[PDB]
Design an enzyme around this catalytic site. Structure first.
Site, PDB file in Angstrom:
ATOM      1  N   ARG A  54       0.743  -1.298   0.019  1.00  9.62           N
ATOM      2  CA  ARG A  54       0.105  -0.127  -0.179  1.00  9.62           C
ATOM      3  C   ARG A  54       0.986   1.156   0.101  1.00  9.62           C
ATOM      4  NH1 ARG A  54      -3.248   2.716   4.970  1.00  9.62           N
ATOM      5  NH2 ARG A  54      -4.785   3.852   3.708  1.00  9.62           N
ATOM      6  N   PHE A  59       1.906  10.604   0.968  1.00  6.73           N
ATOM      7  CA  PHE A  59       1.183  10.013   2.187  1.00  6.73           C
ATOM      8  C   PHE A  59       2.560   9.097   2.907  1.00  6.73           C
ATOM      9  CE2 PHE A  59      -2.221   7.883   4.431  1.00  6.73           C
ATOM     10  CZ  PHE A  59      -1.827   8.171   5.534  1.00  6.73           C
ATOM     11  N   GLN A  62       3.571   1.636   2.718  1.00  7.70           N
ATOM     12  CA  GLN A  62       3.294   0.752   3.795  1.00  7.70           C
ATOM     13  C   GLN A  62       3.474  -0.721   3.255  1.00  7.70           C
ATOM     14  OE1 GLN A  62      -0.465   1.224   5.855  1.00  7.70           O
ATOM     15  NE2 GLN A  62      -0.749  -1.097   6.373  1.00  7.70           N
ATOM     16  N   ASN A 101      -2.042  -0.370  12.210  1.00  3.24           N
ATOM     17  CA  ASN A 101      -2.688  -1.075  13.196  1.00  3.24           C
ATOM     18  C   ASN A 101      -4.188  -1.090  12.611  1.00  3.24           C
ATOM     19  OD1 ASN A 101      -4.335   1.211  14.123  1.00  3.24           O
ATOM     20  ND2 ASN A 101      -2.321   1.732  15.413  1.00  3.24           N
ATOM     21  N   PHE A 112       4.705   1.639   8.117  1.00  2.61           N
ATOM     22  CA  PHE A 112       4.715   2.474   7.185  1.00  2.61           C
ATOM     23  C   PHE A 112       5.889   3.291   7.441  1.00  2.61           C
ATOM     24  CE2 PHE A 112       2.586   6.032   9.065  1.00  2.61           C
ATOM     25  CZ  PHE A 112       1.913   5.383   9.948  1.00  2.61           C
ATOM     26  N   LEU A 121      -1.914  11.286  12.176  1.00  9.11           N
ATOM     27  CA  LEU A 121      -1.578   9.952  12.830  1.00  9.11           C
ATOM     28  C   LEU A 121      -1.079   9.755  14.066  1.00  9.11           C
ATOM     29  CD1 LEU A 121      -0.593   7.974   9.579  1.00  9.11           C
ATOM     30  CD2 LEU A 121      -2.891   8.325  10.213  1.00  9.11           C
ATOM     31  N   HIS A 125      -0.886   5.876  15.833  1.00 14.97           N
ATOM     32  CA  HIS A 125       0.103   5.090  15.306  1.00 14.97           C
ATOM     33  C   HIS A 125       1.365   5.030  16.197  1.00 14.97           C
ATOM     34  CE1 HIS A 125      -2.303   3.630  11.945  1.00 14.97           C
ATOM     35  NE2 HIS A 125      -2.815   4.810  12.131  1.00 14.97           N
TER      36      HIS A 125
END
Length: 164
Positions: A54, A59, A62, A101, A112, A121, A125
């Site tokens: 991903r 951004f 991941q 998560n 990531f 985040l 995270h």
């Protein structure tokens, strides 16, 4: 001192280079040790062979679902999941290394690397390291991503381990 680990990453079996990460064992020792051991593979499973599944430009990138290769899997060295250790380190900019998560206290193996400040985040995270070298490799990975996270090439961690 804090572990230095590496990921060697390819795109369709062609090397992109090496990402070196410092794991902040001084701040999140349990989270750092999980990632360290998954890099070496010393428990019999880990990141070698798994993918950046991903990747979203502007951004993050991941990876780390080494069981299902799609975002639904992964396992920690401790068990299926382990708690959020602390939220002391923040998503301050590109190069931050953080745990993916599925809600509170569900850390496994997915992680990531941020390519921007992902401060929304913070507090959800657990940040546990940062890129020491190879941000250029991260930007190569990012360029194969898309808004949905789908990658246009297969991005594989072909080797990984501990440098110190």
């Amino acid at each position: 001192g804090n572990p230095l680990v590496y990921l060697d990453v390819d795109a369709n079996g062609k090397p992109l280079g090496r990402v070196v990460l410092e794991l902040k064992a001084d701040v999140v020792p349990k989270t750092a040790e999980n990632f360290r051991a998954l890099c070496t593979g010393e428990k019999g499973f880990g990141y070698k062979g798994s993918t950046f599944h991903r990747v979203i430009p502007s951004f993050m990138c991941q990876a780390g679902d080494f069981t299902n290769h799609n975002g639904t899997g992964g396992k920690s060295i401790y068990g299926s999941r382990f708690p959020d250790e602390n939220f002391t380190l923040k998503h301050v900019g590109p190069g931050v290394l953080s745990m993916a998560n599925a809600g509170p206290n569900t850390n496994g193996s997915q992680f990531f690397i941020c390519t921007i400040k992902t401060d929304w985040l913070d507090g959800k995270h657990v940040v546990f390291g940062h890129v020491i070298e190879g941000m250029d490799v991260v930007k190569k990975i990012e360029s194969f991503g898309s808004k949905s996270g789908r990658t246009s090439k297969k991005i594989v961690i072909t080797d990984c381990g501990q440098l110190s």
